[PDB]
Design a protein around this ligand. Sequence first.
Ligand SMILES: Cc1c(C(=O)C2=C(O)CCCC2=O)ccc2c1c(=O)n(CC(=O)OCCOc1ccc3ccc4cccc5ccc1c3c45)c(=O)n2C
Ligand SMILES: Cc1c(C(=O)C2=C(O)CCCC2=O)ccc2c1c(=O)n(CC(=O)OCCOc1ccc3ccc4cccc5ccc1c3c45)c(=O)n2C
Ligand SMILES: [Co+2]
Ligand SMILES: [Co+2]
Lengths: 383, 383
Amino acid sequence: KNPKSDKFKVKRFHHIEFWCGDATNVARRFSWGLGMRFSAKSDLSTGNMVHASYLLTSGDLRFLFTAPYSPSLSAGEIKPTTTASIPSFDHGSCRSFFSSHGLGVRAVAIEVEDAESAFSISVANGAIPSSPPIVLNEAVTIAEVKLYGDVVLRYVSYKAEFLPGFERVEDASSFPLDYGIRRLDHAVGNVPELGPALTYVAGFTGFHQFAEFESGLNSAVLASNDEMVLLPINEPVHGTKRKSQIQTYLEHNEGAGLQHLALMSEDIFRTLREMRKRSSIGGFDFMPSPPPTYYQNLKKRVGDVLSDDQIKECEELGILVDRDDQGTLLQIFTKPLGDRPTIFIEIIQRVGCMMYQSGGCGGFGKGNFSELFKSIEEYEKTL
Amino acid sequence: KNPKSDKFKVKRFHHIEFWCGDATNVARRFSWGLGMRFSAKSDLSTGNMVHASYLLTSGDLRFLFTAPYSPSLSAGEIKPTTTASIPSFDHGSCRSFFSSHGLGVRAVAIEVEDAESAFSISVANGAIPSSPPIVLNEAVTIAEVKLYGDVVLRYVSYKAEFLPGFERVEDASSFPLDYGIRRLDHAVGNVPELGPALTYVAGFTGFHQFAEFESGLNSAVLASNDEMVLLPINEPVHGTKRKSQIQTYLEHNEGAGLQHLALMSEDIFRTLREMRKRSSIGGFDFMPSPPPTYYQNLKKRVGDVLSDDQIKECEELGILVDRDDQGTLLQIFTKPLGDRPTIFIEIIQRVGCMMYQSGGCGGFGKGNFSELFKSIEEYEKTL
Ligand SMILES: Cc1c(C(=O)C2=C(O)CCCC2=O)ccc2c1c(=O)n(CC(=O)OCCOc1ccc3ccc4cccc5ccc1c3c45)c(=O)n2C
Ligand SMILES: Cc1c(C(=O)C2=C(O)CCCC2=O)ccc2c1c(=O)n(CC(=O)OCCOc1ccc3ccc4cccc5ccc1c3c45)c(=O)n2C
Ligand SMILES: [Co+2]
Ligand SMILES: [Co+2]
């Protein structure tokens, strides 16, 4: 059931913003590791004396990396005279965020019809305001409300190129890397208590619970009207045999925050080949691969969707496969993106639910918790 | 003249430590950009609940990247019970350093005969103590005194593998990258006043002034007995036509700090080919290349050292050449390593002064300030 109860018009995920200590080094690492090109900047060279912000793109996926300069460079400015291109930015907030949480996502940004309306309606319906609507160059409106922890949900609306004040990046510095990633599929938060988190966010968005179908978590998914904005939220389950990874996250993150970003690839085989080639030369590492019994067990569950060769290819790359009643999901998880065992990335591709493909086709891979356990148990027997 | 007045026995540069917000992302970027392999770690996986530290090596060059975890992970510890592998580390110091200066060098470490003696003698002779001598696993001694700004000179001495508590890195995560870099040649500081800086450092080390031979700087070089530890220091010259780059550094860095690291290559042509291939895919950018008149002018000044083809190769890679009365220097400068226009890297190779090669052979390239200006002026005429 989809009650289509959005309290304002939501379009798609627009961008994800990381708050960094040094935006240059994080952006360059991510660019090489994920195959995203440098497409826009706002920094000292564009007249921004407040923050350095670098935008990477791959298809429609937009990753923004931002760090503060010395406050001394902008000490004479006030908000009316600011040279910041992102008016919600604050030196103190950014330094406090990074000292508390380490490298991570500050903003989950969605494009809406009218960011001022979205903000007003959200706050009227319980949202905690974070940054009021601000019109940039009479062209783009941006506003922010609290989502969970120190993560904000950012609303952006366009009258009619990333943001005013950002400049397109010099062709020489813009190498056209591309490993197949095309858009943000979903963005997942970890919280201490799932119930209140869901009630809060669903309360101010009108997002509805998206239908699903000993692992240390309970989870639920909030979705927009056309179910293309997908926001799963996890809480820990305590007392388990293995300590809940959600609880480890909350401890190392100093509380709630964004757990993972799931990036859709138009060719997950090529994406994983390219990313794995680069794991040990600056890119990203992946979780340990499932045992061969997991891939033998694939024939029985998805042998009608993937050929033996395609199952062989999943095995070579360590890809996981799940299925619900409507579609099939190919997925894999990186190791944590930075020092702390907190944020990581998921690569996904979805098969089925053709209408365009409906959002969330195949689910989120919850069936892979028990299939990984069974396959791990099976391999001990097969040894 | 070399009075050989070192007040304690100094061996060679040992390592350089960067204080980071996220050590993982900086280390991975530097590894790919410079061709350094991951060789040791001290982090949560080795039992360190205090800081994440990753060591990159290329030949004898050692770059250490360190960031603090949440203090909550180690809140029950005291210094006698610490799980930090670098006992001088302090969460508050590291966060304050990074918030003040951004990404940069915290420690210039030199290997000495006896770090406890070096520390005592240094402080007896004016050095401001930063961290007292600490013996690690009865095997290595480490001590720190202030050098300039918030940069420390770190003394390390070994009874007889980086530091106790560090583990060698898994072969799979240790890709054997190598673009030819072999050791740290010199490390350069920017200060507001050169005179007092020289007097302070020369005072507590016994390092002597190393012989040299409108650009916005005055500089002098301090050197150890065998002149293999080389510490140039710059001060700005104000009122110039173009604003002094030393003054811009001090403004964006919030005061004195390390300006650049000069890395010796055993094959500067290969190093620059490999680094330039990677500039726009995660690595490092280089300063704009000199005009072709600069390379035509090379025939008259170094045509007895480099062939036409070797001069052609310098031109293709943007390499600068200088010469003193004893040797020839090939050098080139990167753009700043991070967000701020502060720290950068120099790649160098020295020709001559064969005895082994004596330290500082060919100088530091001061002659290239006027030759760059003349060549720039010449190219305007040749247009
Ligand atoms: C994050 C996620 C999702 C997910 O998207 C998601 C949402 O979108 C919304 C709803 C709720 C939700 O969760 C789905 C499935 C997942 C994961 C996920 O994060 N993870 C790795 C994980 O649990 O991290 C600890 C890792 O546990 C392990 C610890 C130690 C090992 C040692 C050896 C091993 C060998 C072989 C395989 C192993 C697997 C896991 C190992 C392990 C393995 C998985 O496995 N699934 C299958
Ligand atoms: C750092 C250094 C050393 C050095 O090691 C050193 C020590 O070890 C110890 C003693 C003192 C000392 O200094 C030696 C020589 C250097 C440098 C160095 O840092 N730099 C670049 C620099 O001054 O940074 C602003 C850049 O200025 C420019 C601004 C704008 C441009 C625009 C177009 C251009 C086109 C072509 C060439 C250009 C060159 C410089 C341009 C420029 C160029 C140089 O050039 N030399 C020649
Ligand atoms: Co997911
Ligand atoms: Co130099």
